[model samples]
Target: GLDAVRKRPGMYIGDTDDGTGLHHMVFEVVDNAIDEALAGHCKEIIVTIHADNSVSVQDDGRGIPTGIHPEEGVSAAEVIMTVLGVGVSVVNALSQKLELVIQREGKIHRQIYEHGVPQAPLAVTGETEKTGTMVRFWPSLETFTNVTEFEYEILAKRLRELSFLNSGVSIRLRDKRDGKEDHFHYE
Candidate 1:
C-alpha cells in the first residue's frame, strides 16, 4: 500500500501539474487546520503573501498530529513532511506549485514542508497560551512558469465563495503587495 502510494502519487492528488495541483496542497494543509478549528481548538486563520512570492497561513487552532508515526517510525511532523515532499516533487516534476502549513495546540507544535527543505527537525517549538496553526510556502517559480500575478478582487471573491459554501465560517483576505494592506472580511 505504501509502495503504491509512493509510486502512483497521482492517485492521491489528481493531475501532477496545473492550478488544481497547486490548489490541492493548500486544501490539504488548510483542511487539517480546519479540523482543529472544528474541534473547538481554533477560531481564526490568517494568510499572508510575501513580495518574494511566498505565502503564509496562520490560524488559531490546535496543531497537527505530532506523535510518533508507527509506520514511519518518526514524529508525525516528519511523516507529514515526507508525504508532502513526495507530493510536491511529483507535482514539480510535472511543473506544478506547492504549499506549506504549521499547527500548534496551546503549547505543542507541528510543521509541514513542501518546496523548501525542512529547516528544523520535528520538535516542539514552544508553549502557547492559545492553540493555532501557521503555514508558509514559497511556490516554485520554475513550476509556475506563466504567472501574471494574483488579483486581490479575484481572491476576495474566492474567499467570499468559501464563506458562502461553508456557512457561518468567517473568512478574510488581506493584500499588502502595493505597500498598503487591503483587508476583506466575510461575515
Candidate 2:
C-alpha cells in the first residue's frame, strides 16, 4: 500500500499546486454538509482524513442507503470505483498515460489505456493469489515527450519540511511524466 503511494503521492488527491491544496478540499465536503443543513435535513456530516493518507467527504446532504446499490447487490462504494463521471478527463490531461494494476483472486491483473477512452467489456488480463487488493495504480509516461530532465531536491525538501507541520491528514499525488517516487507522513 505504502509503495503504491510512496511512488506517486499527488495523483490521488494531494496537490503539487497550491491553489489546488487541501484547504479547498474540506469544502468539497463542507459545502455538502451545509447544503444538507439548509435543505432541512442533517446528521453525521463527518469529514475526516486517515493517518494512512485517505480522505472522505460524504452525506444525506446532511446520506446513506449504505448498501444495496440495486441491481448488482454490491455496495455503492464498489460501484464508485469505475462508476465515477465523465469528469475523469480532469486527470487525463495531467497524465501522460496510466495503467491499472490489480492483484486479485490468484492473479496480477492489468489493464492499459490512454486519454482516448477505454473501460467497457472487461479489459481484465492475468492471475494472482496474493495481495488481493481492490486497487493500486502506477502512472505511465508513455504519452509524454522525453520528459525526465528535472530536479527533485526542491520538491523533496518541501515535502520533508511538510512532514513537520502537517496535520494528521494525508493526501495522494502522482506524476506520470516523471521518475521519482516519494513519501512523507506525521501523526
Candidate 3:
C-alpha cells in the first residue's frame, strides 16, 4: 500500500515543497474532523495557525477512539498515530524523505507529540459534554521549504467548496494569523 505512492509525493499532492503541499496537510486533518462531524460526534471544528508556524485544530466530536484496539492491543489513539506515521513514513522512504507526525488526545485527555514524541500523556482532562476530534500538526519545515506562509483567501474558497460538496454540514475557516474568520453553513 505504501509502495504505490512511496516516491510519488506529487501524485498525492502537487508539490513536495510548497505552500500547496502544506495546505494539503491541513485539508487532510480537516477532512478527518469533517468525518467525525458527519458521524455526529463533532459540532464545531477549529483550526488555528500560531505565529510560531505551528498549527492546532480542535473539534467538539467524540474524541478519537480511546479504548484498546481489539487487534493492536493499544489505545485506539495509538493506532491512529501508527497509521498516520506509517503513511508518511512510506512517503518519506520513497520521496524527498519528510517525517510527518499526527497527534491526538488520549482516552481521557489530550496529548501532544512530535513525530511520535510524547509531549504529554493520557490524562482525562475533563468531561466531554460533546464528542469530537482535535488535531495539531506542524508541517515539516524541511518538506515545506518553499511554503513559508498560508493564504486565507484560498483556504476560505476551498472550504466553501467543501461545504457545498457536503450539504447540511457546517464548515468554518478561521485565520488567527490575521484575525479574520469566515463561517459557512450548507443546506
Candidate 4:
C-alpha cells in the first residue's frame, strides 16, 4: 500500500504533490469517522493541527471495534484503519510518526507506527470514560519533498459543510499551533 501510494500518490490521493494532498488525506480520515457517526454512534469530532505539524482527528464514536481480525491478525483499530484504504495511511505515513488510539469498554487501546509500519500490535494503554478514536500523525521530511502547509480556513470550510450535510454531526477545528479554534454545527 505504501509503495503504491508513493509511486502514484496522485492516483490514490488526488494531486498530492501540492497542498490539496493534505485536504485529501484529512477528508478521508474524517469521512471514515463520520461514517461511524452516520451509523448513529458518534456525536462529536475534533480535528487539531499541532505545533509539530502533526494532525489529530478524534471522534466520539463506538471507537472502531477493538477485537482482532481473524484474517488480518491485527486489532480492530488496525483493521478499521486498513479499511480506510492506502490513501489515508499513505498520506499519514508520509509523516515520520503516527499514533492511533481507540477508546472502548472503558479501556484505551493504542498502536504506534514509525515510518508507516506498525511498531507492534495494538495494546491496551489505559482506561478512558469516553468512547472514540484518535489519530495523530506528523508529516515530516521523509514524506513529501514539497513544503505542504495546512490551511485552517479550508479545513473548517469542509467540516462545516459536512456538518450541514449530516444532521446532528458536530465538527470542531482547533489549532493548537495557532492558539485558536472554531466549531461547526448546522442542519
Candidate 5:
C-alpha cells in the first residue's frame, strides 16, 4: 500500500501540481490531530513549516500506540507509520524523509523513514512524562516537482479555519523560516 501511494500519488493525494497535493500533506497529518482533539484526547496542535521546507505537526494528544502489532510483527507505531490508513502512510510514502517521534508510555520513541521505508526499527530514545505525537516530513521534490516550498498563508488560513470549527482546540501555525506565528483558539 505504501508503494501504491508513490506509484499513484494522485490517486491518494490529488494533483501534485498547483500545490494542492503538496499542501494536503499538512492537512492529512493535522486531521489526525484534530480527530484527537475531537475525542478529548488532544488540546493543542502545532503545525510548523521549517527552514528546510519540511513540515511538522505536533499535538498534545494521546500518542500513537507503541505496542507491538501481533500480526504485523512490528511495533504498533511502525504499523501506523508504514501501513495504517487515513493518509499517514500516504504522507510517509510521498515524503523524501519522515520522522515519527512519539512521547508515550513514559518514554520517547523514535523512527525514521525515507520515502516510506523505515531506516530501522522503532526504538525508545528516553523516558518522558509528556504524551503526544510529532511527525516531521520533507516533501519529495521528485514527487512534487512543481511545488517545493509550502506557502505559510495557505497553512495559516487552514489552521484558523480548523480552530473556528473545533471551538476550544488551540491550533497554531508557525513559520520557522521567518519566526512568524499565528495562534488560533476559541473559547
Candidate 6:
C-alpha cells in the first residue's frame, strides 16, 4: 500500500507540482485532530513548522491506543501507523521520516518510521499523565522534490478558517524557523 503511494503520490494526495499535495500532508494530520475535536475529545491543536521544515501536529485528545491488536498481534498504535493506508498512514508513507508519540493512560509510547517502514514496535519511553497524540514528519524530498518547505501564511489562513468552523476548538500554528505564531480560537 505504501509502495503504491510512493509510486504515485498524486493519486493519494494531490498534485506535487503546484504542490497542493505537499500541503495536503499537513492537512491530513490536522484533520485527525479536528475529528477528535468534533467528537469532543480534543480542544487544542498545535501545528509547528520546524527550522528543518519538518512539521509536527499535536492535539490534546484521546490518544491512539497502545495495546496489542487482537487480530494483527501488534501494538494498536503501530497498526494505525502502517495498516490504515489513509490519512496519517499516507502521511507516514510520503514522509522521509516520521515520529509518532502518544501519551495515554499514564504511559508515553513512541514509534519511528523511515520512508514508511516501521523501525520497531511501539516503545514505552516513559510515563505521562497527559493524553494526546503528536506526529512529527519530514516530507520526503524524493517524493515532494520541488516543493519541500511549508508556507506559514497559507497554513494560517486555513487554520483561522477552521477555528471559526468549529466551536470551542483552538488551533495554533507556530513557525520555529522565524519564531512566529498564530492562535485561532472561537467559542
Give the alpha carbon lDDT tens digit for every residue of 1-187 in model 4. 6665556666766665667766767787888788888999999999998887778999999886789878868876665444334445665556577888989999999988875678889999999998999988876454454647677888988998999999889899999876889888876
- CA shift at 38, candidate 1, in angstroms? 4.3
Residue-level lDDT tens digits of model 1 in 1-187: 3334435545654544544444554445555545555676655556555676655556775555667766756766555545432343333222223333344455556544443344455666667676555655555444443442444554455555555655545555565676534333345
**C-alpha displacement of 105 in model 1, angstroms?**
4.6
* Candidate 5 vs candidate 6, lDDT winner: 5
State each model's C-alpha RMSD to the native: 5.1, 12.9, 5.1, 2.2, 1.4, 1.5
Q: What range of 10 consecutive residues in model 5 has the weakest lDDT sum?
A: 78-87
TM-scores for every predicted model? 0.65, 0.32, 0.73, 0.89, 0.95, 0.95
Lowest-sum lDDT 10-residue window in model 6: 77-86
Q: Which candidate number would show the highest lDDT if scored against the true structure? A: 5
CA lDDT of every candidate: 0.51, 0.34, 0.57, 0.78, 0.90, 0.90
How displaced is residue 8 in candidate 6, in Å? Answer: 0.7
- What lDDT does candidate 5 reach at residue 109? 91
Model 2 ranges off by over 4 Å:
1-89, 93-96, 119-121, 132-187
Which has the better TM-score: candidate 3, or candidate 4? 4
In candidate 3, stretches whose alpha carbon ends up further than 4 angstroms from where it belongs are 1-13, 69-73, 84-108, 117-121
Q: Which stretches in model 6 have alpha-carbon errors above 4 Å?
A: 70-72, 84-86
Clashes in model 4: which pairs?
none
Model 5: lDDT equals 0.90
State the lDDT of candidate 2 residue by residue for 1-187, as single tens digits: 3233224435543553442323332333334334444455543233333233333333332132224455665533223232321122223323333333444344444433343123432234665454322222222333222322223344345434444444332222233344344554456
